[PDB]
């Protein structure tokens, strides 16, 4: 269906002027489905917080998932764009959503090395949660040899 194609195409190109035109000038529903079954917030250029913001201010559902359980907060954390992740969580995105490998957004951020994202997510994330390879966030970091990430995580776990 064609408006969902146009709106999601614009979002995935980071064309914020066409996103704004479609949403405010043509008043299009921000959760319209494209021909692949996705909304614009699922497929958007994740390093453009201005796109996320327009879409969420107009009503987009922040907790959409695809088949597997991947949500926008997983992709923001994997790609490492903390500015867009903060917009998502300010609008109600769940930072403890699980994808199909049973990973949290912080597992993905650790795997890619994104240390400002891991500091932001550490205090709200379930740091005891094990992914499908049996690894908590700290165990994963240690397996990668990521000493800076370990220190961040362990400070949130050593409550005592």
């Amino acid at each position: 269906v064609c408006v969902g194609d146009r709106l999601s195409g614009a979002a995935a190109r980071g064309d914020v002027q066409e996103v704004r035109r479609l949403l405010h000038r043509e008043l299009v529903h921000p959760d319209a489905l494209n021909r692949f079954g996705k909304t614009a917030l699922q497929v958007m250029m994740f390093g453009s917080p201005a796109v996320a913001l327009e879409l969420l201010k107009q009503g987009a559902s922040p907790n959409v998932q695809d088949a597997s359980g991947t949500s926008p907060v997983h992709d923001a954390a994997r790609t490492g764009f903390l500015d867009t992740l903060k917009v998502l969580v300010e609008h109600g995105a769940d930072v403890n959503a699980l994808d199909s490998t049973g990973s949290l957004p912080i597992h993905l951020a650790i795997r890619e090395g994104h240390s400002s994202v891991v500091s932001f997510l550490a205090p709200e994330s379930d740091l005891h949660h094990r992914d499908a390879s049996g690894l908590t966030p700290l165990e994963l970091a240690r397996q990668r040899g990521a000493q800076n990430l370990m220190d961040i995580l362990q400070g949130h776990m050593m409550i005592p």
């Binding site: 194609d5 999601s8 195409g9 979002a11 995935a12 190109r13 980071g14 914020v16 494209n34 692949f36 996705k38 699922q42 497929v43 250029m45 994740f46 390093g47 453009s48 917080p49 201005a50 695809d66 597997s68 991947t70 997983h74 992709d75 994997r78 790609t79 490492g80 764009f81 903390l82 500015d83 994808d99 490998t101 993905l108 795997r111 994104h114």
Partner: protein
């Protein structure tokens, strides 16, 4: 054909279209669900039953990919999805980065991109370009939209390597072509080579300080006039022979001091800038010589804290 790409990649959004087919953002279901770019390329087959030169360009991209240069996007796979007597359909699977330089420049806070980061990003851009030119690949359409910028500030060049061919005005869709980064020898329809990309680097360098394109023309002739207003009318010996547009058709204008258009650039930057924005392609610096310029002297690559 020979591979089932549809079982490994899930399309999620259409992001583009060229002369060879559409381009999709897709998810790589074998590798975590990371995003990749899927480019469909239909390869013409000729009388003799062999793929025509497009297959040779794809071979060049696979060759380049065995070096794994850090400042070009990775080619993860080439899938042949269909083979008949008239065509091969390939899907090229590229690394996809979710930010371009247009968006980075648009979102950065006042008062703009830090000096040191402009330097680091121009050094990576030129390293990527020197890698391509040293393997005889000219980009030809460098602009902020196909310079990708990772969330850690790594630059990756994208959207190069396939020959320019006719396509039904783009399939009839997507119709406004940007001339803002094109080199004067191309606007004059003269012969072109690798120096065309350093002209574009010069324009992008300026734009990193301005956060607005330097030369905004709307046609070949208007684009040229906007160029010459700044850098001045070239001498008769710098104007190419045998082109349709005469030096005479433009104003006589001297060069303007470049700091009228680019504020905040230091004196080393100005020199490099002017060396990329040199009208005669034979006098323009090369990417490899640009990497040696004194501008890059203090490249402060990751200290402590």
């Amino acid at each position: 054909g020979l591979c089932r790409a549809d079982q490994q990649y899930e399309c999620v959004a259409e992001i583009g279209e060229g002369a060879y087919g559409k381009v999709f953002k897709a998810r790589d279901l074998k590798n975590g669900g990371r995003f990749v770019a899927l480019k469909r390329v239909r390869v013409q087959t000729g009388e003799e039953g062999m793929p025509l030169s497009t297959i040779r360009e794809v071979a060049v991209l696979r060759h380049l990919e065995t070096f794994e240069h850090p400042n070009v996007v990775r080619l993860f796979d080439v899938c042949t999805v269909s083979r008949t007597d008239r065509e091969t359909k390939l899907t090229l699977v590229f690394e996809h980065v979710d930010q371009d330089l247009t968006t980075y420049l648009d979102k950065v806070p006042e008062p703009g991109v830090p000096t040191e980061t402009i330097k680091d990003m121009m050094f990576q851009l030129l390293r990527g370009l020197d890698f391509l030119h040293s393997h005889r690949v000219v980009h030809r359409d460098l602009k902020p939209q196909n310079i990708l910028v990772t969330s850690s500030g790594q630059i990756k060049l994208a959207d190069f390597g396939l020959a320019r061919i006719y396509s039904f005005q783009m399939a009839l869709t997507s119709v406004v072509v940007t001339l803002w980064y094109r080199a004067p020898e191309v606007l004059l329809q003269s012969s072109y080579a690798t120096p065309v990309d350093l002209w574009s680097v010069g324009c992008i360098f300026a734009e990193m300080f301005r956060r607005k394109p330097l030369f905004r023309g709307s046609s070949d002739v208007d684009q040229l006039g906007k160029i010459l207003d700044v850098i001045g009318l070239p001498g008769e010996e710098d104007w190419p022979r045998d082109v349709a547009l005469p030096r005479q058709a433009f104003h006589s204008k001297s060069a303007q001091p470049i700091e009228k258009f680019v504020t905040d650039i230091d004196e080393l930057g100005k020199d490099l800038l002017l060396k990329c924005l040199t009208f005669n392609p034979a006098k323009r610096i090369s990417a490899y010589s640009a990497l040696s310029h004194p501008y890059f002297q203090d490249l402060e690559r990751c200290k402590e804290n």
